[PDB]
Structures are given as C-alpha cells and as structure tokens.
Amino acid sequence: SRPPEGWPKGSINDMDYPLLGSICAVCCVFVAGSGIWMLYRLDLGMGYSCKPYKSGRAPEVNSLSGIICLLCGTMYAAKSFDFFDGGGTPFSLNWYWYLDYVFTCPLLILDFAFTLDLPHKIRYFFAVFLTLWCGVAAFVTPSAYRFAYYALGCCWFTPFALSLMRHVKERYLVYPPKCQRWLFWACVIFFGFWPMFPILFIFSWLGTGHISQQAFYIIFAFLDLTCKSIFGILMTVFRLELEEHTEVQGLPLNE
Amino acid sequence: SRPPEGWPKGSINDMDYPLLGSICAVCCVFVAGSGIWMLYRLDLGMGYSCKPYKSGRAPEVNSLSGIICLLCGTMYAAKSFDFFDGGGTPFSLNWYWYLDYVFTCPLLILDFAFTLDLPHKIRYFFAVFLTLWCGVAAFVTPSAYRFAYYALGCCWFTPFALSLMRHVKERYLVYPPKCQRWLFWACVIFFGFWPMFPILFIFSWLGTGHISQQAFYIIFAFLDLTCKSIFGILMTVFRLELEEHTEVQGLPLNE
Amino acid sequence: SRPPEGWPKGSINDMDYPLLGSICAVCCVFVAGSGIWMLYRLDLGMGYSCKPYKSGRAPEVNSLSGIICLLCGTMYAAKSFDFFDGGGTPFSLNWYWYLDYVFTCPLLILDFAFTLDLPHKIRYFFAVFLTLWCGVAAFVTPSAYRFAYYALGCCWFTPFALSLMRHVKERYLVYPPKCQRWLFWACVIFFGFWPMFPILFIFSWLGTGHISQQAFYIIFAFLDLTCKSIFGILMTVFRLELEEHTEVQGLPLNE
Ligand SMILES: *C/C=C(C)/C=C/C=C(C)/C=C/C1=C(C)CCCC1(C)C
Ligand SMILES: *C/C=C(C)/C=C/C=C(C)/C=C/C1=C(C)CCCC1(C)C
Ligand SMILES: *C/C=C(C)/C=C/C=C(C)/C=C/C1=C(C)CCCC1(C)C
Helix, strand or coil: CCCCCCCCCCCCCCCCHHHHHHHHHHHHHHHHHHHHHHHHHHCCCECCCCECCCCCCCCCHHHHHHHHHHHHHHHHHHHHHHHHCCCCCCCCCCCCCCCCHHHHHHHHHHHHHHHHCCCCHHHHHHHHHHHHHHHHHHHHCCCCHHHHHHHHHHHHHHHHHHHHHHHHHHHHCCCCHHHHHHHHHHHHHHHHHCCHHHHHHHHECCCCCCECHHHHHHHHHHHHHHHHHHHHHHHHHHHHHHHHHHHHCCCCCCC | CCCCCCCCCCCCCCCCHHHHHHHHHHHHHHHHHHHHHHHHHHCCCECCCCECCCCCCCCCHHHHHHHHHHHHHHHHHHHHHHHHCCCCCCCCCCCCCCCCHHHHHHHHHHHHHHHHCCCCHHHHHHHHHHHHHHHHHHHHCCCCHHHHHHHHHHHHHHHHHHHHHHHHHHHHCCCCHHHHHHHHHHHHHHHHHCCHHHHHHHHECCCCCCECHHHHHHHHHHHHHHHHHHHHHHHHHHHHHHHHHHHHCCCCCCC | CCCCCCCCCCCCCCCCHHHHHHHHHHHHHHHHHHHHHHHHHHCCCECCCCECCCCCCCCCHHHHHHHHHHHHHHHHHHHHHHHHCCCCCCCCCCCCCCCCHHHHHHHHHHHHHHHHCCCCHHHHHHHHHHHHHHHHHHHHCCCCHHHHHHHHHHHHHHHHHHHHHHHHHHHHCCCCHHHHHHHHHHHHHHHHHCCHHHHHHHHECCCCCCECHHHHHHHHHHHHHHHHHHHHHHHHHHHHHHHHHHHHCCCCCCC
16 A cells, blocks of 8 residues: 555545455466467467478467467566555556556557558557557546547547558458458457547546446456457467468468 | 646746747647658659559558657647646656657667668667667756766767768768759758757756756757658658659669 | 765665775776677678678677677666765666666577577567566565565566577587587576576575675676676677688588
C-alpha cells in the first residue's frame, strides 16, 4: 500500500488485492504456456506433416507470436506480485495503465503483417505505438485535456484501422479456403476486440464512471488472454495450414 | 501549474503559456501536414512521371521521412496541451529538454543514410543517440558537471559531424547535377543547423544566461520545422529526381 | 548527496565517492579505448592480411562489438560524474542497479549470435532483455517479493543458458582449430562470468548481507571490463582468424 497506513477507504485504490493477484497469476500461467507451445510447434517443422526446414531452422520472424505471449506472461507475473504485495509497489506494472501495451501492441501488428505480407510494415508499427502512447498520457492527465489526448489517439487509430481492414480484404482472396477460416477468426479478434479497448476508457472512472478500476483490471485480463493467446494460436494454425498447401503439397496461391 | 498556487513570479517557468501553446499547435499542423504529403507522394509511384512500382508498393525505408514528421507533429500536439494546461503537467514533453529528440534525431540520420547509401549506418545511429542522451543529462544536472555532460556530448558529436561531412562529399559526385541541387540544400540544413542546437545551450539560462526559456521554446519550434519538415521535403524531392534519372529514364550514376 | 545535509552516516550510501569516481573514470577510458581499437581494426580489411572488402566497407553487424564498448564507456563516464558529484544526482546511472545493462546485455548476445550464426536470434535477444528487467525489479522492491522477481529472472536465464551452451557446442566443430582457441576463451567468459552476476545478488546487502554496495560497484567495474572489453577483443580476433581461413586463403568450414 503506497500510503503508509494504506489506501484511503473508498478510494479507486481500495480494491480486493488478493483476488486481483490470483487472476493475474492464472493469466500468467495460461499465456506463458500458450507461448511455450507456440515456439515448440514452430520447431517441429513445416505444416501438419512437420516437414523439415531446409536450413534446419525456422524463419526468425515466425518466433514473434510465441515471444509476444512470453513477454505478456512475464508481465502478468510481475503484476501478480504487485497485487499480492497490496499495490502501489516501486516496480508496478499495474500503476501506469497502458504502459505494458506500449511493448506488445506494436509487436502484435508486426507479427500479423509479416504473416500476411501486408505493405507498410513500418507505418503500421508506428501508428500503433503512437496510439498506445496517447493512451498513457490520457490516463495520467487529470484535466479535461485527458480527452484531448484520447482524441489525438483516435486520430491515429481510426485511419490505421480502416487502412488495415482494406489491406487484409485484399490478401484474403489470395489464400486457399482452409486458410481463410483461420484468418477470419483472427480478423474478428482484431476488428472486434481492439475497438473494445477505447470504448472501455469512456465508461471507466476517467470517463462516465460506470466501471470501477478493479473491474477494469479483470476485463483487461480477459482481453489480453484473447488478444495475445487466442490470437497467437490462430496465427500459428494459419501458418500450419498455409505451409501444408504451399510447401508440403507445393501448390500456388491465387494472387 | 506544478506549484499549487502556480509558478513563482519571475521564475524560469513564469512564461506566456497561451502563446507557447499556440505556436506549438501551429507547428503541429504544419509538420503533420508535411509528413502526410510526404507519404502520399511516395505512394504515387517512382519519379515525377509517377512510374508504377513493380511490387506495387514502395520500399519500406522510404517511409521514414514522412513517419518522422508525423511523430514530431504528434509530439508538438502533446506539447501544445501542456502549455494550454499552463505547464508542469504529469505527461509533459516540455519538461525534460531533449527527451523528445532522443526518438527523432537518430531516425533522421537513418533516413539520410538510407537515402544516400552512406556506410556505417549503425555507427551513425548510435553516435546521434548518445549525443542526445548527453544533452538530457546536461539539462537535468544542476552542478558544474552539467558541463562535463555537455563536453561528453561534443566528444560524440564532433567526430560524427566530420565523419559524415567526408562521406557525403564522397557520394555527392556519384549523383547527377539536378540531384546535386537538392542534396546541397539538405547539407546546408544538416551542416548549418544541427550545430546551432549546442550553440544555443551555451547562451541559454543554463550557460551565459542570454536567452530565456520561453525564447528557447520558440527558437526550437522554428528549428524543428526546418530540421524535420523542410529536410523531409528536400529528401523527398531528391528521391523523385534520382528515380526520374535511374528508373524512369534508366541512366547510370557516375560512381 | 541526495539528502540536503548528505547521506546519513553508516547508510548503504555512506561510501567513498572519490575512489568510486576514479575507478569508473579508468574503467571509462579503457573500455572506450578498446572499443575504438575494435572499430579501427575492422576498417582495415579482412583477416590478418587486411584483405580489402569488395564493397569497400565492412558488414554492418561487425560494428556491434565496438559499439557496445563505446556505449559502456560512455555510461562509465556518466557514472564517474555522479560519484564525483557525491552521489544521488538527478541523472544517475549508479542509482537503479541493472538499468544500464538493459541496453548492453541484449546487444552483447546479438553480437555473439551474429558472429557464430546461432539460430533464434530474436528468442535469444528477448530472453536476455527480460532477465535484466527482472533484476531491475528485484533491486527496487523492498519486500520479500524481491526474491519472487529474482526467481522469475532465473526462470528466463536458466533455459537460455542451457540452450546457448547446446547451440555453441554444435558450431564449435564447424570451425578450424585456430578459431576454436578464441571461441573457447569467449565461452569461458560467457559461461564463467555471466553466472557470477546472479550469485553476487545473493551475497549483497539485498541478500545475505556479506558484500557492501561500495564493494558491489567495484566488482561490477571489473566484471564489465571483462564482459565487454575482453569479450569484444576475443570476438574481434575470432573474426580475423576466421577470415584469414575462409576469405584470404579460401578454405571451407567442416560444417
Ligand atoms: C494486447 C493489447 C492490445 C491488443 C491492446 C490494444 C489497445 C488499443 C487498440 C487501444 C486503443 C486506444 C485508443 C484508440 C485511444 C485511447 C487510448 C487507447 C490505448 C485506449
Ligand atoms: C530534430 C532535432 C534535431 C535535428 C536536433 C539536433 C540536436 C543536436 C545535434 C544537439 C546537440 C547537442 C550536443 C552536441 C551537445 C549537448 C547536447 C545537445 C543535444 C544540445
Ligand atoms: C555487461 C553485463 C553483463 C554481461 C551482465 C550480465 C548479467 C546477468 C546475466 C544477470 C543476471 C540476473 C539474473 C539471472 C537474475 C536476477 C537479476 C540478474 C540481473 C542479477
């Protein structure tokens, strides 16, 4: 507890620290486990037939899905320690909302872009990075300028979102049906869930005031499990399907 | 105002926050606009004849000019919000001088090096990054060691500057006359203006004490407009000229 | 001295600041000198016979050894300034243990991996980065959770260490005897000294309490000289030997 006597009663920080700690310890194991599986299955070979790589090693970039999970899992361990130490600790990843995501979100979009061979990899990376930084600023600012920062971040996000939706619909047809399945669910996650983040900001204690900070933590735990683990599992299987088509069976894309 | 009652009268922080806010809001629009133009014109094709790219997309690195402007423009929006909120806000890019430049200056030098194909891209990047960090330290330190940090930064900068001047004069002759024009003005900016930054430090309130902090902000706004926007416009046109020569008209460099 | 009247007598901060300052000023010169030599010798050509590069420039990645030294040397200058200013200064690289290493350690492992062509360059980089971050957290935390953070970091380090040891033994045989000599001493440094860092944490004031913080600084100065300078000199000579074999004399590896 940052205050010597502990958090003032009825403060935004007056939460149920044990439950919070626990939820993150579970989030940690499951995300880290999924990441471990991801890197292990990448090392078996190419496709469901686990065809051996010619160089005897997998492409460097294919490791990102799994790395992102382990980075997230490591951060949720840290976060558990903070909650179990009662909150407001000197190395707290709970304190500055969105700072942890400044390290993962841009990696996620790289993962996605490398997997599909989207254009403008660098533009996409920076767009996400700036959006996340605007969130950090929005949460630490107490004036109304909090919303100036939120709007700046929407200025980045909205073009980014439309641009991506357009690019993805262009590559969708290239791929064979069986790969199209996995990509669709990946898109539901990206186009369905990413917009949830900025909508929660509005209903939080820093907006309308409908959702407490404790609730905010729990919701984000579920959102991170979906946007890192499930997303990574769907990226993995999309590559196994693709490889089976192109490498194991040696067939061409529609292009 | 960081102090509850506000900045002490006659302090370095006793400035004209509205005017400061405004200058940055304008700097923001103009820099962000220029960056937008830069990425748009890159997407039209190759050269003044807008020849279509073979891959149907432009090279990744060519996006840096434009990205650097948008990053700068986003930072000047943030800075506006701080000034209009009266200064000393929790997320202030005005507070720690030179911290914003730790993100742009090294990208600028990469942009320049990729464009000309200078050697030692990594050496050049680190040289700039360290110089900028020495500036950060020089400004936060109140002892005379402030000048120890300044000198350390000159130790990095001075070799870097001479090294670059030598490399650039080697590539200048390679290029055809029409491209040589644009490169010369780019060089005037780099060799004329970059040295201005360290000379202003000496005459600031942290050196001789001739230039107030308010003035320091205004001067830097003009310097950033020149070193990011105009520089980026000159990099853009140099590539359009070069492409017209090599790709549209298919002629060789002197080399 | 961070406290106005200065460090309380008999505090962990009640050290011999002048001696500390001096040790770092020497560490600074020697490391920076070694780095300078490294980049100079790289520019002479390929091998002991200094065969000219075909492109007329050396590979970008070969610069990392030397860059890492100069980055370390610049940081030890900063650290000298802090000690000579008596400690607890606003820009102190002495204050947060392990924060400086968050910038060098991952670069070191990249250097090593590029030199040997180890697989999983990105995995290796992140593994080191996370380990170092866990150290930072372990040192700032005052509860017992300090050890939770230490253990998390061992979870990263231990697999990383075994994985590397396995990969290196696979590449050792590839290389000719004369190169094998240099690689062995590089391995002694990596496998002998890297494990020293986490063992010192246990005997420090934050563990059993056998080694003072002053002593901790001195030990780390010697460890950094070994893990950056000597290591870099051994990487350099390994490349000169390798090049003499493969490029100057045009012979094949065992593979
Ligand atoms: C793993 C975490 C993910 C996928 C997080 C995504 C977060 C966003 C896309 C957040 C968006 C924001 C804005 C568009 C505006 C204000 C700030 C944010 C961060 C809430
Ligand atoms: C867009 C911003 C640019 C181009 C800034 C450039 C800044 C410098 C080259 C500053 C140089 C410095 C030194 C050489 C010594 C002390 C610290 C600085 C940052 C003032
Ligand atoms: C140039 C500096 C080097 C090579 C430093 C290496 C440091 C380590 C490998 C430190 C390891 C740690 C752990 C394994 C656990 C706790 C934290 C550390 C940083 C002491």
